[PDB]
């Protein structure tokens, strides 16, 4: 406040990284593998991660990567993990795997609902292939019967 | 939008 007060460091230094409490975990959906990391990288399209997240895992067959808001175990980060810790730099992103609907199948791993930013013209689409004629499939299946 | 305090 005044020039008659003991300073901490030089006048151009405004942020300091104190003891081990300054290491904050990346949120859900972000990951950071390096041992001296600087930014949290969002998960690749079609992959999910936990809080620690030194790596990602791919959504299995019959499931596509999207937001599980209404599911049994939502996997998105909370307000505490993102906004109360990092600020506006890392927002909440979807990292759940949702099952394919009935009579649709998904044979590949790591697929995501392709987003649309201008929702009026184009709507978001999920990459769930329909079963051919003569085949039914149940729900979240990797192939038709 | 909704601003919440808790």
């Amino acid at each position: 406040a005044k020039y008659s007060i003991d300073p901490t460091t030089y006048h151009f230094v405004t942020h300091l990284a104190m003891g081990p409490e300054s290491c904050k975990k990346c949120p859900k959906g972000y990951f950071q593998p390096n041992i001296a990391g600087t930014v949290c990288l969002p998960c690749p399209s079609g992959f999910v991660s936990t809080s620690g997240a030194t790596g990602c895992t791919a959504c299995s067959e019959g499931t596509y990567h999207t937001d599980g808001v209404g599911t049994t175990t939502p996997g998105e980060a909370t307000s505490l993990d993102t906004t109360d810790t990092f600020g506006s730099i890392y927002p909440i992103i979807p990292n759940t795997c949702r099952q394919c609907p009935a009579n649709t199948y998904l044979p590949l791993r790591g697929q995501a609902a392709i987003a649309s930013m201008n929702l009026a013209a184009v709507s978001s689409a999920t990459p769930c292939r329909p079963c051919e004629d003569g085949t039914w499939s149940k729900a979240g299946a990797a192939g038709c019967q | 939008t909704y601003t919440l305090t808790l």
């Binding site: 808001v69 209404g70 909370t78 307000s79 505490l80 | 909704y2 601003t3 919440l4 305090t5 808790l6």
Partner: protein, 49 residues
């Protein structure tokens, strides 16, 4: 809740039924969510932890 303005509403949880006692020590995450309808599939609108 009441009608929502720019002014925050009064304490919605001020009633005596909103209380809790924890049986284990540590960090407990208390969350609050906002829906529009009182039925189960009503759309979530906001959340705070």
């Amino acid at each position: 809740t009441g009608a929502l303005s720019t002014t925050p509403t009064a304490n919605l949880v001020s009633a005596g039924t909103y209380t809790v006692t924890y049986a284990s020590i540590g960090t407990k995450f208390v969350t609050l969510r906002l829906y529009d309808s009182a039925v189960a599939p009503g759309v979530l609108l906001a959340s705070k932890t």
